[PDB]
Design a protein around this ligand. Structure first.
Ligand SMILES: [Cl-]
Ligand SMILES: [Cl-]
Lengths: 149, 8, 149, 8
């Protein structure tokens, strides 16, 4: 549980926002890329795994599951790569709702930033700090520290 | 540009 | 001290590696950029602060301390922006040693990657996972969780 | 290219 993450890919302004969700806390990291390719996905996962103890990634679609470049990054960084089949149909709803929430935040900030990448990082910041009272940023640190101890 | 990422 | 970070900028291959160090743990985040500008610095700090609870950043030089764009990102993200004067002369030697270690790691991986940005992220991963015994990634999570509790 | 970031 502390090492499980889910990839998620959503679109805005003709670009692609790639998101990794720490399943047990709801914490996220995200980036803006021109298109989702195996090479962009692989680099994003190398970055994530040098920052958090990533044990498993549920890929966002079959092409990133299949991609030998994505598998090569998961090998390099010690990540178990898995599919993202929603055996719990609850997952489908959680992702869709998260995407709708991020797009709403992005719209509320969009005019403070010239570039979409700035607005997406402002939305990562707001989502991780939001108290729902603990934040997702507090939950992920508590969960992993509990696991280290 | 009067934006956070472009103050001009 | 759980919220205190230090910026650091080093050069390799005609490019700039910008690094944020969590001073109490030694944990790092890093990116490759073509040149250090206040816009690039500001974006990097906005990314960092959406991911960890950044209270204070000691800037790496006077230009990023002065930069109104860097101050605007520190305002947006709720960061106190401070100078990086090594009133403790130990700071100066710790950064130099860190940069030398990162460059050594980058050379040990350099030939597994086409692009420098991949080698830099492999070096972040190796640095943060290295047990010295706990890793910097373990220390930063323990420090902040102890603070939250 | 026989590299982790460029398998070709
Ligand atoms: Cl695409
Ligand atoms: Cl420069």
């Amino acid at each position: 549980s502390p090492g499980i993450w889910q990839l998620d890919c959503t679109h805005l302004e003709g670009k692609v926002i790639l998101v990794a969700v720490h399943v047990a806390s709801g914490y996220i990291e995200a980036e803006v890329i021109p298109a989702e390719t195996g090479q962009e996905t692989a680099y994003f996962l190398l970055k994530l795994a040098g920052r958090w103890p990533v044990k498993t990634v549920h890929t966002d679609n079959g092409s990133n599951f299949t991609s030998t470049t994505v598998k090569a990054a998961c090998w390099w960084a010690g990540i178990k790569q898995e599919d993202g089949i929603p055996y719990n149909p609850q997952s489908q709803g959680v992702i869709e709702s998260m995407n709708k929430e991020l797009k709403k935040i992005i719209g509320q900030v969009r005019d403070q930033a010239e570039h979409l990448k700035t607005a997406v990082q402002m939305a990562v910041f707001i989502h991780n700090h939001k108290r729902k009272g603990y934040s997702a940023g507090e939950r992920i640190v508590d969960i992993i520290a509990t696991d280290i101890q | 540009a009067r934006k956070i990422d472009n103050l001009d």
